[PDB]
Design a binder for this molecule. Sequence first.
Ligand SMILES: Nc1nc2c(ncn2[C@@H]2O[C@@H]3COP(=O)(O)O[C@H]4[C@@H](O)[C@H](n5cnc6c(=O)[nH]c(N)nc65)O[C@@H]4COP(=O)(O)O[C@H]3[C@H]2O)c(=O)[nH]1
Ligand SMILES: Nc1nc2c(ncn2[C@@H]2O[C@@H]3COP(=O)(O)O[C@H]4[C@@H](O)[C@H](n5cnc6c(=O)[nH]c(N)nc65)O[C@@H]4COP(=O)(O)O[C@H]3[C@H]2O)c(=O)[nH]1
Ligand SMILES: [Mn+2]
Ligand SMILES: [Mn+2]
Ligand SMILES: [Mn+2]
Lengths: 332, 333
Amino acid sequence: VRARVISHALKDILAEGDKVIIMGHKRPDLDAIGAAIGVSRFAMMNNLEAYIVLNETDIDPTLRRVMNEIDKKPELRERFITSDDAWDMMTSKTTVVIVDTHKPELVLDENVLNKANRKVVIDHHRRESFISNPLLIYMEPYASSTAELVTELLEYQPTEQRLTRLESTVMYAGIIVDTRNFTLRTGSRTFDAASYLRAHGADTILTQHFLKDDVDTYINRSELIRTVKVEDNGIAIAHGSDDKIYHPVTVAQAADELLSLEGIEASYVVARREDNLIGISARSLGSVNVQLTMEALGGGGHLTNAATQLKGVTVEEAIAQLQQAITEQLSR
Amino acid sequence: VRARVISHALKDILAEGDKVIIMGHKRPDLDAIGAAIGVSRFAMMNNLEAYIVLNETDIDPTLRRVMNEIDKKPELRERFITSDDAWDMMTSKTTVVIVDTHKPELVLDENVLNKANRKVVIDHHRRGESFISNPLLIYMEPYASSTAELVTELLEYQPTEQRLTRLESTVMYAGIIVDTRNFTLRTGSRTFDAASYLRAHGADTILTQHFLKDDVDTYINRSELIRTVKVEDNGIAIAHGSDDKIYHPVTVAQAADELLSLEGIEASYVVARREDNLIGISARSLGSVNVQLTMEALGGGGHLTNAATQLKGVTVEEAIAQLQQAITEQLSR
Ligand SMILES: Nc1nc2c(ncn2[C@@H]2O[C@@H]3COP(=O)(O)O[C@H]4[C@@H](O)[C@H](n5cnc6c(=O)[nH]c(N)nc65)O[C@@H]4COP(=O)(O)O[C@H]3[C@H]2O)c(=O)[nH]1
Ligand SMILES: Nc1nc2c(ncn2[C@@H]2O[C@@H]3COP(=O)(O)O[C@H]4[C@@H](O)[C@H](n5cnc6c(=O)[nH]c(N)nc65)O[C@@H]4COP(=O)(O)O[C@H]3[C@H]2O)c(=O)[nH]1
Ligand SMILES: [Mn+2]
Ligand SMILES: [Mn+2]
Ligand SMILES: [Mn+2]
């Protein structure tokens, strides 16, 4: 429906410009990069000239692995340009496309954004702040990702110049990342888009390769997990020893990983973050609402994803406050 | 369409028999069960009479978790019958459908098969020497992900008044997940089309996660093999269990497997006390390093990516040593 008209409607909004320039959000992830690459391709399909804005300093380790493939094995590189090159090349008929974000403060380059007279916003979140006077707004909160939304727009244009395998892989990876391998916000349309991409060469094992965790993170993550106590009621608590500082990501990951073990519906992981700060990551399948649990300990978030931080306490005191909160939350 | 043709042809063959009996392979997995279920929904969509064969001895831990949900929908629970119930109700007009196998000695009940007059076969394996005798229809597709994927396609072309239920599509979806290791093996656009169809009918991802939860204890175990690894610069990794401890062959195989999922690892070698006298080596590789050669050269063997060996007498630290030496060997040309 929307996806039907908006596709053709925007090859027109794009047909009316010298070039098209694409920007994601700062610290681009694979949804951002894949969505941009898609749109890149969507424009090329109408022989429109397209470039994606990326600076050396935006490219993190995960993205770095991607870009190495992009240099070693295609000609995808040459469509990536710096902020400067973007500015020094855009007129006022140049269409800027914003993918995977809607707040201007978050756009990869607010200057390249502000300069452009013709703005379009493709994002899959819900709407305060927002881009000024956009020629079009494709906001669809129920998609899994921006890469999904762009995938189903590709399916209307000149079938001629097809998605490369590699472009497909990266779009695919963005979907994998945002859905956690098809376990979150996945609808039939996610699978429709995954079908389309896989039809065009999307490599699942290369996708695995971009995403692989490292040894030390596994080891550190499992240190927390081997301490878990699971209650009959499905609540599970793991912890780090009070004398050891854990990186807050491996704590978040531990909490996630536990949701994949039998009998665990909600996970809480407690570990020293700083010299006088304890962190707790909470996670659930949706039966237990871990937002309430974190809010009652000074944190917050969403029903299945939440966290909090506590100062001055030892690991054991925070666990105590944690149990107090849980037993209070699930008294019946 | 081919599947449209097959769908419609199967409708005739099922309707002209007097009822349908559905049977997968021995120690059925979620795919065989998902597939059988889909076939029984297919039948119902044409007010045919369908039964799935399943004995209580034929239900592993995973499957029991699944039957636990099925018991809540009597309509669905009542479709499953035992080998006996099945034999005593077969006639000459009864049509038996084999799912997820094509090998007569792999069928769940050889007896029920042998009494079968009218037969159908749907599988995603490739033909071996043996084969179901004189089937009325054959829907094999060696490149598909699962029999659940194939059955799913056939479903798409039938009356939709009494649709595939939420619970039915969930089990079929689970079969696809097990067979493809969560869309990481032998997955194709058609696999995603099946998945989309299933998901459109309420296939529940959380419940599927439930069916497939790992054992806490076994996570921790596999964890302390992986915890031990040392990865050389060339991407060869070596993990070991203590020699005083003893590990399940599956814990070991899983550790070696799960090491490949880590960054910068081309090949894994896990080594742990397999008995009291014996030591075990599991070896895996992305596809580059030649774990076969390494293992063959230790009185073992397997395949380029998946090989292994056992060594009786030695103790781990020396088994590790024999590994280093054999590796150092094929490595330096
Ligand atoms: N009201 C309130 N809410 C809070 C507070 N602290 C955290 N939250 C909220 O609760 C969410 C829980 O994630 P986290 O456990 O703190 O843990 C962090 C972080 O450790 C985790 N994370 C970061 N990178 C990764 C990753 O590569 N993988 C995984 N599995 N998790 C990651 O996700 C979280 C960060 O993302 P967020 O979207 O911000 O998601 C946060 C955030 O929305 C707080 O003091 N007050
Ligand atoms: N020449 C020679 N070849 C050998 C020897 N041992 C194994 N092989 C061959 O190479 C494969 C290596 O797997 P494994 O590490 O020994 O590990 C074992 C076993 O631990 C593992 N396994 C057992 N259960 C499971 C399971 O539920 N899941 C998974 N992923 N693996 C399992 O699969 C392997 C056994 O099944 P196979 O299909 O036969 O797979 C074997 C077998 O084909 C040997 O001593 N000499
Ligand atoms: Mn993003
Ligand atoms: Mn996104
Ligand atoms: Mn199968």
